[PDB]
Symmetry: D2
Subunit: 292 residues, 4 copies
Amino acid sequence: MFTGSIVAIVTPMDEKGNVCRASLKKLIDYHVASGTSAIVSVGVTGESATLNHDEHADVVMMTLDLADGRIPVIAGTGANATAEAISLTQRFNDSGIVGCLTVTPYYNRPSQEGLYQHFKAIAEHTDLPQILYNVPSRTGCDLLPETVGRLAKVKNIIGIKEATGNLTRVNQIKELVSDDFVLLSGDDASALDFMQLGGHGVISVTANVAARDMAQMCKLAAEGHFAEARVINQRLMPLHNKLFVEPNPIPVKWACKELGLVATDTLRLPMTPITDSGRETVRAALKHAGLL
Amino acid sequence: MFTGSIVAIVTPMDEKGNVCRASLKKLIDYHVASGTSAIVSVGVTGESATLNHDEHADVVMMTLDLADGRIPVIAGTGANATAEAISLTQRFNDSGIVGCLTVTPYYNRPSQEGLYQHFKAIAEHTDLPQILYNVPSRTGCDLLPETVGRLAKVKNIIGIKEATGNLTRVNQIKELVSDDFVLLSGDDASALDFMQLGGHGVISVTANVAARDMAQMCKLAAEGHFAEARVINQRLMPLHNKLFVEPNPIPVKWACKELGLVATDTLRLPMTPITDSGRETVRAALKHAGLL
Amino acid sequence: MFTGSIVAIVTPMDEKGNVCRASLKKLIDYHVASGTSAIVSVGVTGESATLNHDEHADVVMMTLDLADGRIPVIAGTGANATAEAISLTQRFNDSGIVGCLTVTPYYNRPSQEGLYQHFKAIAEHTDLPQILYNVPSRTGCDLLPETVGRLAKVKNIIGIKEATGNLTRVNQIKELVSDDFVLLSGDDASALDFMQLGGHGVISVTANVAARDMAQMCKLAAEGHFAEARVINQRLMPLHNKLFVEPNPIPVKWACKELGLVATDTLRLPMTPITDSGRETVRAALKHAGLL
Amino acid sequence: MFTGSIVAIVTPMDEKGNVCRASLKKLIDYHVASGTSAIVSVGVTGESATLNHDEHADVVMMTLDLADGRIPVIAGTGANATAEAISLTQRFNDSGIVGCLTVTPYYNRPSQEGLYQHFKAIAEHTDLPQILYNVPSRTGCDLLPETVGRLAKVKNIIGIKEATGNLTRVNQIKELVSDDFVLLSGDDASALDFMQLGGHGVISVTANVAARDMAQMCKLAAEGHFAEARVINQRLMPLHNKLFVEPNPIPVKWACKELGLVATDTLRLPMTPITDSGRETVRAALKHAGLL
């Protein structure tokens, strides 16, 4: 549902840069077998930026069909114009996705009030559960805990993917929201810490290639066995870091290809092919995780 | 024209958020009479983020029509997907615009090599002059001088709107590019400094309401009379700062309304109306400038 | 010892700016009665910067005598020259203090290697236990976890006061050091979080005026009762923040005076008297904590 | 003299870390012959941090004696306790120095009002000209233009060494102070830009090894011939950056040794010897400058 290890899944592509169904099916079977709790379809790791809204919807629906009721699917629905966010959200109403992951508007730098009105209008135009998403280093905008508290009073807004890497936010948000409001890390390197402070899981890039370890780590964390969870985190830490050695998802798509999970590591510009030095860096991190 | 005071013009709207032709005409007439060098149509101050490409194109064509050859027009054509930037550029090919202002991809955070490939591809598939546009605080990425140097070798990449507010970039870029490559500030508060270091002009928000002063200040700067340009800049400095007291273009659309230059100050979400405190702060800035 | 709520005690002064013994004794009796685990004497909150080494030693020794074996006393021994740090440390050898709190050199910005050699030489010139102290916003220098791991192999170096406010450091340091190496927060607002991640206590400014609450919070935290600890933290949070509304220790000395714990709130330049607006801000925070 | 190229001179040392008179003499003779405007004795590049006040004073008196009236000498007199700065200043009253360079208190992080009171008190109790010195990355605090404006009204506060590398400060300060208040860069890499914006000179680390070039570059800058000054600056730019590849003055003392200007490159802890990689990087920078 909205708990444990949730993969921010890549959108695997053929050499032409279009979705490759056989590779997507291989990934979804892998996440079912691995114990991944849910899939976020067409977030930033899934190249939401370079897919148009039609292509993006086609991938979400294909992901849903291929999941075949075995694993819940959350759609990325973020947009920097409120009307476009509503419109994109409506494509998925009565579709079968369990919720939406919707980012703070990027580039136009709204105020906290602008953020409130933006997410509130979106929530009012759907019955789908809404997971807020804050990532200031991408967006230029920072959804502060106080505004998260405000928005959590909307029945429809049920959690946050917090990707600042600033762990003080866990308890700042938690004291302001109800006990069933869900706190998800959006930063793999600090995600176990995030959970140790009272977070309920992680929307993860690492999970794309280390799904079993990630699911086991988040289960141990939820059961309070933090020391046993750290043994896994330490195994996974070079990956947590090196999967951003070049802009995400360039590294994780290369790693997927190296593990035979996808046929090609093709991306859409302005993402470019991984460098040679990047390959060797990601290879060593996979080696340290015990996957190669 | 790509020197002097260039206005990043607002897209004036009626109460429903649709472009208001009569207000736009008045603004354009104002810029013709006030000596503004050119108009940037549908950049961030023109709410590029919340217009769809159809409306974006309509506003540019309307600006061209209303300008009626009296003032050059540069279209904002930025996008975070390379194919989308190319497509948008194609809509304006034989439109009458003199050039394009194209931002670094926002949100997806490409590498320097990705930026190179992004802008090279856009440049290839048009004859129109291209002005690069760097604004890290909005985009999450930073086009460094080295990469600006590589891109300046492309014949129709002719300049940069540099909006870091980091003044060391003027001469780091200048030494790496040829003498006819144009360096334009995108940060009103540091713009006079920017020109004094070697910059050729400014793509300005302040120019929306202080067009005559901005034009004279930029001319004095180009003539080397920096002391007499600073006197004007000192009067304009509260405006340079307080036009961003709330997210741009909220303050400047309000200012345009207060001066009678536009019928309403309506914006599209996620921009929201100016607060009372911002009303007061902007009004005092306009009075310091001698505009009220 | 090196655990629980450790107060970074103010150096109370008469109006002439010299240590006031009656006020210091009142504070030490208060910390004994309150359950404070230890006193840090003449750290930054105790105005180490504006006391010369003689005056600073006189205060440490006076604090020790007045403590009278009832509560352990750690001496501040930091200096930005290694030879001065050794010399200051040696004044306290065979004195009765239980350990030293020694800051990364400020102003001269040493390398990580410089930090290693600096603290290693200090440790080799004493039998006293050494607590490393990292506060980049004051010093201009950041002791990274890797170097902390290196230094922890010195028998004599036994813990760190980590005052970054960056909680990722707790587990980065912990995986690199032995299980008896002590992790202390140096940032009151994030200190409970710090403890929840595996920290062993806090060297606290808040403890100066809320010693009982602080001791109870750290005991609850050490016993894993984090939710009961947060009720206290929330009570104490305006203090955690507002005790730095003006430069520390200007606010906490005013608060001490207001609570009748010290006779005067006098400080040495360049610290200046609290502003009127600062008084009312600190008063409200004391009120919220239930102390006024 | 308080314009032009002013060298923040190294304090050359023998293998035991004591001032080496013969190396110092050679440096001073070099600066007299090379057209350096003045010598800052015992600033941070002169290891003020690791000399005690006795040695600090000795080095200044030795510099004065060796200079023998041929070059003006400014003593570093900065301290983080106001009474200590006053005392240090008193040691130099009728010494022959032309002025003092006094840093914002480091570590204790005073307010703007504290900085005002700090520097006003120092100024009151001497007749010597005072140059304020702002370097936030070392000190943890930032003397803002507003406060520089208040302090410039004090008759013997005559200028500022501005080492933010933030070039907007040149004209923010200039408009708030009188025309004979001197604005000096403390950041070699942005110094030419600083002078082009209105600055009068630089207190420079690079000048230790490229004194002739620095003197000519600063003169060309003062004459308004910025293009011909930039050619020199372009040759010096790798030195401007790589003299801080490791903490200053480690690289520059090594460079001085490599050129034969000083007998050894010894420093005092917590500064440590240059690494092999830094040896290589600085040597290539010296060759780019045409010095080897």
